[PDB]
Amino acid sequence: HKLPAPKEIRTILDQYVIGQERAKKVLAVAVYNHYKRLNQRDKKDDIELGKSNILMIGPTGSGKTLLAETLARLLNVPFTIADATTLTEAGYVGEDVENIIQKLLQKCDYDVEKAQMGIVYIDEIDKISRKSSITRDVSGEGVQQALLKLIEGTVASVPPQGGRKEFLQVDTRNILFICGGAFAGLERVIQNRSARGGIGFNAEVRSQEMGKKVGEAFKEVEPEDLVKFGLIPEFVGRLPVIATLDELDEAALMQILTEPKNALTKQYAKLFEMEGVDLEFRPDALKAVARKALERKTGARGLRSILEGILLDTMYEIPSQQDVSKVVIDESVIDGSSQPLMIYEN
């Protein structure tokens, strides 16, 4: 009866994420239908409850990881965020792939029943992609094969709580898995298969760089692309659902500055406020900063860097000073033409 409205979740996520549409929808739909699977898991001839593992392709600073924690805060079942580099197949020190389940168990108080009703977010999945075999890819291809069966759903003897200086079993049948990585190079892959011009008089000729497009190219991704990247065909299939995130936008960067609950601006304001200066900005000022981030091609992270440099001088002077009450920022300050202006009053 819970039935948390798809929009409710989407809007809760909209409080922090500012711009993603496909991602918030797919997950919210997934979350909306995941409860139903467990809610109606009784024997009404609906017993297979086939799961569809989600994927999150896209570039950096797209909020791939931000969603998982915010999702965790509105999730009543167990949830954990896992890393891929740490995991390796057995026979190497690494980290055992099944260990990912143990992490979830701890958070749910080793409630096996509850544990089988949790979600996971395996970040940096693009890292384990294989090359193109000569030697065992303990961290790449190997990891995929080990995780392969887990995604489909098998039973394992997750370690039991207690150092112990009975190897309880746990089934993966109804444990949804979501893998989101910052795949680098996939844009080129899709561009090549779609159109790869070749020298010739009667052969189509196209530029190596396809209209200098990065965003919106992920929407054309297909299973073959992932296989070229290095993902094992079997693994590509294990995750039926695929999603994509645009790179960025000028409007989206101006909104992220203030709109999000825990925006970067608030942190600086809070800090400056405790220093005794009223941190302030301007509308055009905020827009100017966004332009800089787009040139850095670093994503949302870029924003932070720009702010610090402009405010480095002020963050070094203001503390010693005990007069300034308000510090405003103008487009001229972002441009650098002027120096950070202050109001020596109080």
Ligand X SMILES: Nc1ncnc2c1ncn2[C@@H]1O[C@H](COP(=O)(O)OP(=O)(O)OP(=O)(O)O)[C@@H](O)[C@H]1O
The answer on whether 230 is annotated among ligand-binding residues is: no
254, 283 in Cβ contact below 8 A? no
- Tell me how far apart the alpha carbons of residues 310 and 99 are, in angstroms, rounded to a whole number: 45
- Provide, rounded to whole angstroms, the least separation between the CB of residue 10 and Mg ion: 21
Which ranges constitute the DSSP H helices of the chain? 6-14, 22-39, 64-73, 99-107, 112-115, 141-152, 186-194, 223-229, 233-238, 250-258, 264-275, 283-296, 300-317, 331-335
Q: Which one, 34 or 108, has the nearer CB to ligand X?
A: 34
- Provide, rounded to whole angstroms, the least separation between the CB of residue 65 and Mg ion: 3
Single out the residue of 19, 78, 118, 142 in contact with ligand X (rule: CB under 6 A): 19
| Residues whose CB is less than 8 angstroms from the CB of residue 335 and which lie 6 or more positions away in sequence, other chains included | 288
- Provide, rounded to whole angstroms, the least separation between the CB of residue 79 and Mg ion: 16
Q: Which one, 58 or 118, has the nearer CB to ligand X?
A: 58
Single out the residue of 60, 99, 145, 265 in contact with ligand X (rule: CB under 6 A): 60
- Tell me the three state secondary structure of residue 286: helix
39 binds a second copy (CB under 8 A): yes
Single out the residue of 12, 14, 32, 65 in contact with Mg ion (rule: CB under 5 A): 65
The answer on whether 62 is annotated among ligand-binding residues is: yes
The tally of CA atoms less than 13 A away on the side-chain side of residue 227 is: 9
After what residue numbers is the chain broken, C–N > 2.5 angstroms?
Answer: 132, 165
- Provide, rounded to whole angstroms, the least separation between the CB of residue 244 and a second copy: 12
Per DSSP bridges, beta strands 54-56 and 178-180 are parallel
- Provide, rounded to whole angstroms, the least separation between the CB of residue 126 and ligand X: 8
27, 273 in Cβ contact below 8 A? no
Which of 102-110, 128-136, 297-305, 315-323 is the region at the interface with ligand X (rule: CB under 6 A)?
Answer: 297-305
Which of 85-93, 190-198, 251-259, 327-335 is the region at the interface with a second copy (rule: CB under 8 A)?
Answer: 85-93
Q: Which residue is nearest to ligand X (CB)?
A: 63
- Provide, rounded to whole angstroms, the least separation between the CB of residue 131 and a second copy: 6
139 binds ligand X (CB under 6 A): no
Ordered DSSP codes for 136-167: --TTTHHHHHHHHHHHH--EE-PPPSS-----
The pattern of x and - marking residues 277 through 316 that bind a second copy according to CB under 8 A reads: -------------------xxxx-xx-xx--x---xx-xx
- Tell me how far apart the alpha carbons of residues 75 and 264 are, in angstroms, rounded to a whole number: 25
Residue 295: both structure tokens together: 């040139």
The answer on whether 61 is annotated among ligand-binding residues is: yes
Binds 93: which of Mg ion, ligand X, a second copy, none (CB < 5-8 Å by kind): a second copy
Query: Binding site for ATP, residues?
Result: 59-66
Instruction: Point out which residues bind Mg ion (CB under 5 A).
Output: 64-65
